[PDB]
From a paper:
One of the important factors responsible for the powerful vitality of diatoms is their extraordinary light-harvesting capacity, which is achieved by their unique antenna system, fucoxanthin (Fx) chlorophyll (Chl) c binding proteins (FCPs). Here, we solved the structures of a PSII-FCPII supercomplex and a trimeric [name] from C. meneghiniana by single particle analysis using cryo-EM, which revealed detailed structures of monomeric, dimeric and trimeric FCPs, as well as their binding to the PSII core. In conclusion, the cryo-EM structures of PSII-FCPII and the trimeric [name] of C. meneghiniana provide detailed insights into the structures of various [name] antennae and the assembly of FCPs within the PSII supercomplex.
The trimeric [name] of C. meneghiniana was determined as a homotrimer encoded by a gene homologous to fcp05 of C. cryptica. The molecule weight of Cm-FCP05 is around 19.7 kDa, consistent with the previous results. In each subunit of the Cm-[name] trimer, we assigned 8 Chls a, 3 Chls c, 7 Fxs and 1 sulfoquinovosyl diacylglycerol (SQDG) molecule. The secondary structure of Cm-FCP05 is similar to that of Pt-Lhcf4 and Cg-FCPII-A except for the existence of a longer C-terminal loop. An extra Chl a412 and an SQDG molecule are inserted into the gap between helices A and C at the lumenal surface, building hydrophobic interactions and hydrogen bonds with Chls c405, Fx306 and Thr118 of B-C loop. The distances among Chls a406 in the Cm-FCP05 trimer are larger than those in the Pt-Lhcf dimer; for this reason, an extra Chl a415 was found in the Cm-FCP05 trimer which may play a role in enhancing the efficient EET between the adjacent monomers. The trimeric Cm-FCP05 structure revealed in this study represents the atomic structure of [name] trimer containing a substantial amount of red Fx and Chls c, enabling the capture of blue-green light.
Numbering used by the authors:
A (entry chain C), B (entry chain A), C (entry chain B): 30 to 210
């Protein structure tokens, strides 16, 4: 029933190993699964972009606090948030609070606002031109977003795993990023 | 749609900063939010009353356990439950278990029992004269309960925060309550 | 409304102390409660069987890891999973992952597959002769499973509690299993 929906594309086609959509699956369950997938994909895309920018030597100018701790002094990856020498835990708490504010008030599907598919958060407020695309281009853009989200999920998982196994003696020379210092 | 519901009163009027009720919000969502708000308000009202009673020098006679630890020997506030010198953790576990029993079996809205609004737990069992009030007085009492609950929420949060910041060097002479010892 | 359902049998008859099904309870609720009860009963039955098999001196041949830690060297009970000398935590993680796979993909009620009652996971895939039983025997087997599950919940809770109180000085001689070692 959902074998022709968004995300079922070559080469795997419809790929449901654990059988989440097996049987008479309702549209609500598939919508929930797709919403979770798109949320994770967007978060992982942002996380991978941030990891790449930080590890490329690009940091915000100035200091993260009044103490004088410069931005380009904390490590990259998990050590930047959780570790002995990381950003102040007040900064992490404020970041989490800001994310919670965004999810409660901003990053949400407001009912009766014109959203036309799962993951559409425009709510009639912010729109950069989601009407010039025809029917096929809209689906193509949504598929690009979803697949990039899946790839970024796997990539950010690999980045954290590799950053967390270096102390244990597993420090390989990764193809593009090199040694994950 | 919910701008004339209970709790929308001067001077703020309908106050929805995060936009929980924005768009075509369903009655179920508002009912859930109001239930959570009323439950928090009742819990916070009881917490503030107990905090004030304990800090005023009023304690239960006798001892909290067979060891001989008198009631008027444990500290006030968070230090009474979580700390080196607090009430026995068996007492805390029993309190939590009793609260769970009350909330699962007693402090609940039993379906098909005559409850009139969200937060009504009478269930046709305990009633002190609710039907004696006319229509306007019922709404007035409900609004009083809700607003006292909000105020007690903020007050108990402030009391806990002030208690927890005294060891950090923040010990102000709070109004009325004085130094929060 | 639910006083004649499965599980309401002599000598207690219908037994709802906390009043979960009080008032106009929906089948849905009751269905969720029965599903949770059956899941807990099956898990506890397996747990009790494993506890008995391990404590009777029956262990898998060989070693649990490449290091050489033989199966018949770890303790019995909670000490086998959580403790200083337990099975490798990699094994525990893999067991939890396998259980999660089973619940997500295998041990579930697939909609539109022919399941007749709550707890039926056949899904038209695995069946050892369920339709061979007549109506009375089907209910009898379901009641036997449910009551054995309840008894197993009590038994596994008692076994874990008795294991955890031996270091505290409470080491009684249990009737059948004797001392827990
Ligand atoms: C948050 C993660 C997440 C979620 C919720 C989904 C959700 C979905 N994906 Mg999907 N996907 C993801 C990540 C995710 N994806 C990633 C990272 C990739 C890249 C490898 C893909 C690649 C992918 C393809 C190629 C396809 C889908 C499809 C689908 C849809 C139907 C199949 C399904 O339920 O997924 C699969 C099942 C799950 C995600 C269930 C969750 C299982 C997790 C892992 C929990 C298990 C825990 C347990 C301990 C197991 C761990 C050990 C285990 C590894 C052995 C559904 C909307 C199909 C689709 O669009 O059909 C319309 C489809 O063809 N996905
Ligand atoms: C998962 C997302 C994520 C997370 C958790 C972090 C976390 C962190 N980043 Mg970071 N970053 C990210 C994405 C992320 N980043 C992206 C995508 C970029 C590229 C622009 C950067 C660029 C960046 C730099 C240049 C620096 C950090 C730094 C830091 C650290 C200090 C916090 C800070 O100053 O933030 C700064 C955050 C930014 C400059 C950009 C954040 C943008 C977020 C992701 C927006 C997403 C939500 C947004 C409101 C959606 C808008 C929708 C639209 C319709 C309006 C902290 C560990 C600093 C540090 O100490 O390095 C070690 C630092 O110097 N980051
Ligand atoms: C448990 C807390 C709680 C809950 C669930 C509600 C729920 C509600 N309140 Mg309410 N209120 C509360 C506490 C709460 N209140 C307190 C303590 C006060 C006193 C300041 C008020 C004062 C108040 C007024 C004056 C009014 C309401 C109204 C309402 C209703 C619609 C607006 C709304 O959703 O609330 C606001 C939104 C929320 C509570 C969403 C939750 C947000 C929390 C903070 C989670 C965010 C976490 C995240 C990390 C952010 C933290 C950082 C942030 C501070 C920057 C709704 C039933 C309105 C009403 O009755 O209209 C009919 C109205 O006019 N409230
Ligand atoms: C959030 C609520 C709350 C919590 C968590 C506590 C927690 C605590 N109180 Mg306390 N207290 C409370 C409210 C609360 N109190 C209120 C409202 C009062 C005023 C009557 C008191 C008066 C009080 C005294 C006098 C003493 C404590 C003490 C204590 C400590 C030992 C436990 C004990 O003996 O309780 C005793 C609890 C009570 C005597 C009253 C509890 C009443 C609860 C809130 C009833 C709420 C549910 C109720 C059944 C609903 C009825 C519905 C109706 C339709 C029937 C412990 C830290 C003792 C201590 O060691 O101090 C350090 C102590 O001496 N409290
Ligand atoms: C709650 C269930 C449960 C849990 C958590 C454990 C946990 C453990 N058992 Mg154990 N065991 C169980 C039930 C359980 N057992 C049952 C029911 C039996 C009887 C067959 C055994 C027999 C057993 C032996 C003989 C040994 C262990 C051992 C161990 C330990 C190492 C893991 C291992 O090798 O497992 C091995 C697990 C098994 C051999 C049987 C597991 C069977 C599970 C319960 C299947 C349930 C799901 C199933 C796929 C449903 C099928 C549905 C059907 C339609 C297809 C670990 C602490 C070993 C150890 O080190 O002891 C200290 C060891 O030597 N167990
Ligand atoms: C106006 C304003 O303020 O905002 C607007 C701005 C703007 C532009 C309009 C907007 C937008 C669109 C945005 C931001 C789109 C962002 C898209 C984004 C950020 C997409 C990331 C993909 C990452 C992938 C696929 C990673 C794969 C990673 C993979 C496949 C790996 O395996 C990683 C690998 O890594 C390892 C593990 C090891 C290495 O050896 C090898 C490599 C490296 C391969 C918004 C949303 O509207 C907000
Ligand atoms: C028969 C039986 O057994 O039970 C029956 C008995 C009875 C009586 C019939 C029943 C009842 C009704 C009850 C119990 C009603 C209780 C109502 C209650 C307990 C209402 C508290 C409000 C607290 C507020 C507003 C606090 C604000 C606190 C604020 C605004 C603060 O900012 C606190 C501030 O603190 C700081 C932070 C710092 C200080 O510098 C300044 C102050 C102090 C201002 C029940 C429920 O039916 C149960
Ligand atoms: C083909 C394949 O691969 O799989 C198939 C195989 C097969 C056979 C077909 C299948 C099946 C059916 C199965 C596995 C059924 C299993 C049923 C099972 C395992 C039922 C346990 C009850 C335990 C109880 C009641 C414990 C009570 C414990 C009580 C009442 C206590 O108080 C314990 C007490 O302990 C203390 C606390 C202290 C002691 O002093 C005294 C005692 C000991 C009394 C499946 C499911 O289809 C899977
Ligand atoms: C996530 C988005 C975000 C938002 C929306 C946001 C809003 C505000 C507002 C307005 C409401 C104020 C007034 C304010 C003030 C301060 N912020 Mg924010 N802040 C955010 C993020 C961070 C991070 C990541 C850090 C940080 C810090 C500080 C410090 C330094 C304190 C100190 O130096 O003692 C002060 C005074 C740093 C820190 O807390 O250091 C301990 C630091 O790491 N902030 N901040
Ligand atoms: C929340 C409501 C509540 C209920 C409904 C409730 C019911 C029962 C029942 C009947 C079912 C019994 C039989 C019972 C027995 C004991 N209780 Mg309760 N008890 C409640 C609360 C507390 C608190 C707060 C404390 C406490 C204690 C003890 C001790 C002392 C043990 C010891 O001295 O060794 C014993 C023997 C104190 C404590 O456990 O200290 C270690 C203590 O702090 N209890 N208690
Ligand atoms: C729950 C069911 C379950 C499944 C479905 C499952 C599947 C696989 C697969 C195929 C996907 C492989 C390839 C694989 C391989 C290894 N397993 Mg599994 N394994 C399961 C259970 C356990 C337990 C309980 C333990 C264990 C272990 C090992 C070790 C030893 C590593 C070492 O000696 O360094 C290796 C190499 C032991 C352990 O990890 O000890 C550190 C141990 O305790 N495994 N295992």
């Amino acid at each position: 029933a959902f074998e022709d929906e968004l995300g079922a594309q070559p080469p795997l086609g419809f790929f449901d190993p654990f059988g989440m959509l097996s049987g008479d699956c309702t549209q609500e369950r598939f919508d929930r699964l797709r919403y979770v997938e798109i949320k994770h994909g967007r978060i992982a895309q942002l996380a991978f972009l941030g990891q790449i920018v930080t590890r490329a030597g690009i940091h915000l100018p100035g200091s993260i606090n009044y103490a004088g701790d410069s931005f380009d002094s904390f490590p990259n990856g998990v050590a930047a948030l959780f570790g002995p020498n990381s950003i102040p835990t007040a900064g992490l708490v404020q970041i989490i609070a800001f994310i919670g504010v965004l999810e409660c008030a901003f990053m949400r599907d407001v009912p009766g606002t014109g959203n036309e598919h799962v993951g559409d958060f425009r709510n009639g407020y912010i729109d950069f031109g989601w009407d010039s695309f025809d029917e096929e281009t809209k689906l193509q853009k949504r598929a690009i977003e979803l697949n990039n989200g899946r790839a970024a999920m796997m990539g950010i998982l690999g980045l954290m795993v590799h950053e967390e196994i270096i102390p244990l003696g597993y420090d390989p020379d990764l193809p593009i990023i090199g040694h994950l210092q």
